[PDB]
């Protein structure tokens, strides 16, 4: 069970750790988060009490190094950093734990929510979407644009999601225009799965990462990516049975976790209606269709 210590908390802030969140007061004796489950990626996220503008945060995996948070009064944000000195880090964490200045990652033993939202998400894939190779953790915020958004402007601070465009030469084979536009199986199976992602696990990893950035930061481009990757599967007549069954589980847990109050800005009415009621896969997503009909009948 790993620890992310905080040097201090000089500004009042709401702190997220995965699906959980805590209020910290200006200069509250808060020194971090302990008992973080090994084996999963995690996200630690921030919304300042005095400017709710820019939710921002850090994807990390405690297996990859010793990480801490320290407020930078110049740049005005909580920054993740790596401690290279293991003994110094162990000594810091031991002191803060002994003085009980840390919140405990509040996992219920029955509760598989975080595993279910991150099953296919790997830090190595996050670091290719979010490029900052000198750090082992990844910064994301509310305003970061995607490579696709940037084509339609600073390349270094972009989300390099896989570009999906249904009306693109990549998506449509010469002489199969109608076939490829109305049945996207070629695009899903040959171009994306075989060609770019190599396997369904990497595709689902990116879809799950896109959802979490949309939910935790209200990142609009991330929301567009999540819907495009759902729509590409639902618009394909030929999908492996194991991928459809897994997609139904992935979406069920995403719809289950979404705050009820953000359904209006995080769910695209056209995509969901098409996917559940018109698409090739309209009868393949039983769990997702049931939770959507019971939780968000207005959207449909």
């Amino acid at each position: 069970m790993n620890t992310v210590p905080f040097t201090s908390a000089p500004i009042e802030v709401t702190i997220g750790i995965d699906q959980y969140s805590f209020n910290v007061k200006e200069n509250q004796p808060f020194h971090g988060i302990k008992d973080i489950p090994i084996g999963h990626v995690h996200v630690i996220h921030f919304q300042h009490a005095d400017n709710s503008s820019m939710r921002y945060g850090y994807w990390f995996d405690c297996r990859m190094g010793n990480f801490y948070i320290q407020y930078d009064p110049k740049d005005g944000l909580y920054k993740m950093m790596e401690e290279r000195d293991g003994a110094k880090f162990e000594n810091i964490v031991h002191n803060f734990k002994e003085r009980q200045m840390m919140v405990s990652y509040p996992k219920i033993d029955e509760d598989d929510t975080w595993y279910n939202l991150t099953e296919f998400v790997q830090m190595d894939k996050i670091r290719k979407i979010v490029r900052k190779d000198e750090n082992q953790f990844s910064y994301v915020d509310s305003s970061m644009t995607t490579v696709q958004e940037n084509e339609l402007s600073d390349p270094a601070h972009s989300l390099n999601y896989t570009v999906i465009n249904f009306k693109s030469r990549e998506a449509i084979r010469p002489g199969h225009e109608m076939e490829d536009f109305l049945d996207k199986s070629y695009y899903l199976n040959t171009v994306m799965l075989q060609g770019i992602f190599k396997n369904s696990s990497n595709y689902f990893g990116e879809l799950q990462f896109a959802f979490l950035n949309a939910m935790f930061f209200g990142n609009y481009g991330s929301s567009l990516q999540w819907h495009a990757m759902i729509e590409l599967i639902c618009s394909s007549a030929t999908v492996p049975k194991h991928m459809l069954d897994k997609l139904d589980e992935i979406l069920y847990y995403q719809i289950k976790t979404l705050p009820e109050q953000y359904s209006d800005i995080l769910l695209n009415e056209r995509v969901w209606n098409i996917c559940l009621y018109s698409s090739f896969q309209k009868n393949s997503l039983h769990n997702t269709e049931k939770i959507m009909e019971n939780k968000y009948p207005e959207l449909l």
């Binding site: 009306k167 693109s168 449509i172 225009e177 109608m178 109305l182």
Partner: protein
């Protein structure tokens, strides 16, 4: 974006453009079967592809054989239209390729955009104009070449005959739309007006009669009267 009354002069500028109307591509007769069920029989159709500046009409005849063994023909008809327009653009020298294609029905946008991905600089646009191009099959010489076709065929016409020798393309397009609107509203009455005087004939190389400027004014007035007479018969007003 979309073409309307606000940007109407754009039709007659020096940027090459084509209108595409797909309303006569998939045509059927509905009839009773021996068992008293209903069935369709396809008849030959056409793509109506028109340069509104020059009058050049690219009439692609759609022979009933293209439907054989196909499903969802109303959907296929949009894609076959987009395929044939794409093939037509590719067949034209670069300096004759359109800069814009305006579809008369919004359902043609995605099929044509997908077929024209290779031409990212050709704008595919809808229109808010209600254009009467469905009435093309009321022009006897176009109806004849479509119904006689035994195989796919492209036939080239000038839908303005020699009018551009005497009038602008704005005026020629206005005359064409008024003639087609009349033919669409009351075909029998419109054709009566056009052919009631045997002394005015259709040249072998023309679609419409050889009216003098003064006779076109009389014809145009008779067509507006037909449209208003019919409108007061529809709506009881």
């Amino acid at each position: 974006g979309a073409m309307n009354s606000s940007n109407y002069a754009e039709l007659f500028n020096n940027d090459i453009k084509l209108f595409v109307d797909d309303t006569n591509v998939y045509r059927v007769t509905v009839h009773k079967t021996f068992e008293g069920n209903v069935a369709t029989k396809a008849i030959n159709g056409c793509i109506f592809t028109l340069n509104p500046k020059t009058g050049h009409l690219f009439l692609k005849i759609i022979h009933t054989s293209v439907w054989a063994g196909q499903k969802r023909l109303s959907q296929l008809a949009k894609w076959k239209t987009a395929e044939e327009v794409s093939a037509l653009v590719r067949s034209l020298p670069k300096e004759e390729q359109p800069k814009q294609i305006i579809v008369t029905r919004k359902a043609m946008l995605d099929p044509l955009e997908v077929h024209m991905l290779d031409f990212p600089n050709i704008a595919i646009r809808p229109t808010e104009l209600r254009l009467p191009f469905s009435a093309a099959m009321s022009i006897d010489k176009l109806s004849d070449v479509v119904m006689k076709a035994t195989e796919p065929q492209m036939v080239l016409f000038n839908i303005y005959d020699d009018w551009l020798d005497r009038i602008s393309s704005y005026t020629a397009f206005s005359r064409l739309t008024l003639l087609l609107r009349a033919l669409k509203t009351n075909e029998e009455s419109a054709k009566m007006i056009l052919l009631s005087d045997p002394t005015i004939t259709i040249k072998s190389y023309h679609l419409w009669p050889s009216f003098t400027d003064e006779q076109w004014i009389t014809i145009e007035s008779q067509m507006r009267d037909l449209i208003l007479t019919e409108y007061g018969r529809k709506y009881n007003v």
